[PDB]
Write an enzyme that holds these catalytic residues in place. Structure first.
Site, PDB file in Angstrom:
ATOM      1  N   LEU A  19       5.719  98.810  68.435  1.00 60.30           N
ATOM      2  CA  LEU A  19       5.893  99.882  67.703  1.00 60.30           C
ATOM      3  C   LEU A  19       7.468 100.125  68.297  1.00 60.30           C
ATOM      4  O   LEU A  19       7.629  99.976  69.496  1.00 60.30           O
ATOM      5  CB  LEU A  19       5.214 101.177  68.287  1.00 60.30           C
ATOM      6  N   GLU A  27       0.163 111.238  64.861  1.00 59.63           N
ATOM      7  CA  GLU A  27       0.319 110.249  63.859  1.00 59.63           C
ATOM      8  C   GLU A  27      -0.483 109.030  63.892  1.00 59.63           C
ATOM      9  O   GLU A  27      -1.149 108.762  62.788  1.00 59.63           O
ATOM     10  CB  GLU A  27       1.800 109.604  63.969  1.00 59.63           C
TER      11      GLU A  27
END
Ligand SMILES: Nc1nc(=O)c2nc(CNc3ccc(C(=O)N[C@@H](CCC(=O)O)C(=O)O)cc3)cnc2[nH]1
Ligand SMILES: Nc1nc(=O)c2nc(CNc3ccc(C(=O)N[C@@H](CCC(=O)O)C(=O)O)cc3)cnc2[nH]1
Lengths: 182, 182
Positions: A19, A27
């Site tokens: 990421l 999230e």
């Protein structure tokens, strides 16, 4: 067919394979709910992802729980440890869910990445919705989510179960968006 | 990998897409038993057959109960009403079979015909057994079982669950045979 993705301001979704942004507990949590929550009485959802993406899930998370896991790879000879199925293409993956016996076990189909797969599916003739998290801040990435044709897809200003105001986690803001196409 | 068939003395296995001999209750029972009996509880046997074979079964017996029914058709758009799966080739069906989610639901694989499917299955490499019922009379037929490579297969003079004696029903004699390839 649903697609789920979280993209930075600049449309990056990956970096070095990880990421481009620090972990966002809530999230990740929303992604767990959406892909897990089956609308039907006793049916499960199928998740489709390419090789790199399977590998980007913390091993102790594999296979994604409460869901059927399918790996797309024109290359792997056998399905990665823990995956439910292997398909060589997206088309072959979609077919397989049309098999009588599978059809009655699967509820929602979710495409969770990566890039070339988002690419393929977004183009795919049919009714498709995109669940997009907009992480409002620039992150350095090497992999990007495609432009969303605004001729073809429409934003649903409201969505059963999806919050509407701007979330913030670790001084990172982001909002949940839902686009549809028919 | 198992194949089962009943054959006349003249190797006939079908006529006008029907059984060349009158129906043998007890031979049907045996086909039923062997194809149905799984060594593992919570697992079913998978039966594979060509389209002509599917439609050859009384609509009331379709799909064959207690078993996963897999139809092979190059043609066919979708799977006939009642089938569990549809495949284009035998190789494709066997591949379906190694899919992990499928792998844990299926115990044995039985091939039920037609002569084409049999043939292809016969040369398929690996451990294979042939369960052949020799009906001891000639019967007019249009379809025929391929011949067994004696250079390859070996008659097992014995086999658990398979009665050794010459059987008779309605004046017709028949015997159960078991062949293995390694
Ligand atoms: N909104 C969105 N967020 C994401 O993080 C995301 N990630 C992927 C691809 N990568 C991943 C990597 C790891 C896990 C994962 O570990 N999932 C577990 C943990 C969930 C949690 O801890 O809350 C899961 O059970 O869903 C999921 C997707 C695809 N679409 C996304 N879409
Ligand atoms: N040994 C053997 N005998 C067969 O009759 C046979 N038949 C086929 C193909 N044709 C058929 C046609 C009908 C049914 C059928 O109705 N089967 C039911 C009923 C058995 C019974 O009523 O005793 C089943 O539950 O299997 C099966 C196979 C393939 N291999 C064979 N193999």
């Amino acid at each position: 067919l649903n697609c789920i993705v979280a993209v930075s301001q600049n449309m990056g979704i990956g970096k070095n394979g990880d990421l481009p942004w620090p972990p966002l507990r809530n999230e990740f949590r929303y992604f767990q709910r959406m892909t897990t929550t089956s609308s039907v009485e006793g049916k499960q959802n199928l998740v489709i992802m390419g090789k790199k993406t399977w590998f980007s899930i913390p091993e102790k998370n594999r296979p994604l729980k409460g869901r059927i896991n399918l790996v797309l790879s024109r290359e792997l000879k056998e399905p990665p440890q823990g995956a439910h199925f292997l398909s060589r293409s997206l088309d072959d993956a979609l077919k397989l869910t049309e098999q009588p016996e599978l059809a009655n076990k699967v509820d929602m189909v979710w495409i969770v990445g990566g890039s070339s797969v988002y690419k393929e599916a977004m183009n795919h003739p049919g009714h498709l919705k995109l669940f997009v998290t907009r992480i409002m801040q620039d992150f350095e990435s090497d992999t990007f989510f495609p432009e969303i044709d605004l001729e073809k897809y429409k934003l649903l200003p409201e969505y059963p179960g999806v919050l509407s105001d701007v979330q913030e986690e670790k001084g990172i803001k982001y909002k949940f968006e839902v686009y549809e196409k028919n």
